[PDB]
Amino acid sequence: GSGLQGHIIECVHHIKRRDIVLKWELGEGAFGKVFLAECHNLLPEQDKMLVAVKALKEASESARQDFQREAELLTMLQHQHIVRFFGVCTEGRPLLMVFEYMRHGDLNRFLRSHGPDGPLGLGQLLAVASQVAAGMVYLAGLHFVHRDLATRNCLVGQGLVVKIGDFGMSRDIYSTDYYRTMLPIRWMPPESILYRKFTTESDVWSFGVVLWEIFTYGKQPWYQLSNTEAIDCITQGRELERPRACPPEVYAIMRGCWQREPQQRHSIKDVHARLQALAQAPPVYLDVLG
Ligand SMILES: NC(=O)c1cc(NC(=O)c2cc(-c3cccc(N)n3)ccc2Cl)n(-c2ccccc2)n1
Ligand SMILES: O=c1[nH]cnc2scc(-c3ccc(F)cc3)c12
């Protein structure tokens, strides 16, 4: 149910196994593990560089063919706000996908660790939002539907650089963010919960939810409610409240992403243009004054 596979239906670089030196396990899911590794002879002037390596547990013909198609699409995705894909290693089991290493981990973990529970300021929160929007503009321009846009599926590198990307293990690491196939219901618009239909318009809705995560420093949307209760609020048209750290100007943008009718939601290009203008000239808003 990945966006990569969704886009596949609707030359890959090969790295020698011996050029990869596994250093530590970063995470794991049902499909395999993710390692921190050193990769030799990959980038110029960097005889050694850190990479994140996704290892696939299953080595069957269908898993191999799916892997290849995903690797072809990942090679094609090239943007400043998309996690860099360096290539594969198909030298037997486990099949490996090599990505750049994002030193601050996923954006949800980053927000929670840089929040009140020092804390990121308004200008930094707007820069994070603008970068996530820029990656989504790129994906929409390719008619690529993410299907699971959320802060847990964004990564943070050196110098507050934020990019869209994940190692396909969020349904395991953040199982609490999904409901049973495992659907990310708190991030979904009513037509996706009801008809299980994902579009660029449903990605825009999830972007509004990402904005809410950003300005609550990574809190789960509808945190006071159970999964079935959250489905009810969304299908009935209840809206997430404006976070305290969120200026009215950003809340108006979220509300634009959350129009009930998919055809009435702002385009991501317009959402990005608005957030970019606010990141360069932040509104004078003190969260303490509300
Ligand atoms: N839930 C799943 O099974 C699932 C969900 C995903 N992520 C995507 O499809 C996905 C991945 C990227 C991306 C791009 C660049 C680097 C980078 N690291 N990621 C962007 C958008 C999407 Cl939408 N994978 C998955 C399957 C294979 C590899 C990684 C993840 N598996
Ligand atoms: O990831 C870890 N977490 C806790 N203890 C250990 S001991 C060794 C590891 C390790 C080292 C290299 C790897 F490729 C994978 C795992 C490790």
Domain ranges of the chain: 1-101, 102-278
For residue 86 the two structure tokens come to 């360096």
CB of 168 shorter than 6 A to ligand 1: yes
Consult the annotation and say whether 23 binds a ligand. Answer: no
Q: Residue 28 CA: which ligand is closest?
A: 2
Q: Residue 27 CA: which ligand is closest?
A: 2
| Residue closest by Cα to atom 12 of ligand 2 | 24
Consult the annotation and say whether 26 binds a ligand. Answer: yes
Candidate list 148, 166, 177, 203, residue with the active-site label: 148
Helix 268-280 and helix 122-141: axis angle, to 10°? 150
- Tokens 């991030």 found at: 187
Resolution of the experimental structure, in angstroms: 1.9
- Give the CA distances from residue 13 to residues 17, 20, 56, 115, 232, in Å, rounded to whole numbers and listed in that order: 13, 14, 17, 39, 46
In whole angstroms, give the CA distance from residue 247 to residue 240: 14
Is residue 232 part of the annotated active site? The answer reads no
- Give the CA distances from residue 102 to residues 10, 105, 143, in Å, rounded to whole numbers and listed in that order: 30, 6, 26
In whole angstroms, give the CA distance from residue 275 to residue 126: 7
Mutate to test the pocket of ligand 2, among 24, 26, 89 (most ligand atoms within 8 A of CB): 24
CATH code for residues 1-101: 3.30.200.20
Whole-number Å distance, alpha carbon 283 to ligand 1 midpoint, is 34
- Give the CA distances from residue 41 to residues 14, 38, 72, 163, in Å, rounded to whole numbers and listed in that order: 12, 10, 21, 24
CA torsion, ordered 163, 164, 169, 175, to nearest 10 deg = 110
Method: X-ray
Instruction: State which ligand 1 atom lies nearest to the alpha carbon of 3.
Output: 23
CA dihedral sign of residues 58, 64, 65, 68: positive
CA dihedral sign of residues 4, 130, 247, 245: positive
In whole angstroms, give the CA distance from residue 82 to residue 100: 10
- Tokens 């996530």 found at: 132
Q: Which architecture, in CATH terms, is 102-278?
A: Orthogonal Bundle (1.10)
Give the total residue count for the chain: 290
CB of 243 shorter than 6 A to ligand 1: no
Consult the annotation and say whether 67 binds a ligand. Answer: no
In whole angstroms, give the CA distance from residue 107 to residue 157: 10
- Is 229 buried (19+), middle (13-18) or exposed (0-12) by CB count in 10 A? exposed
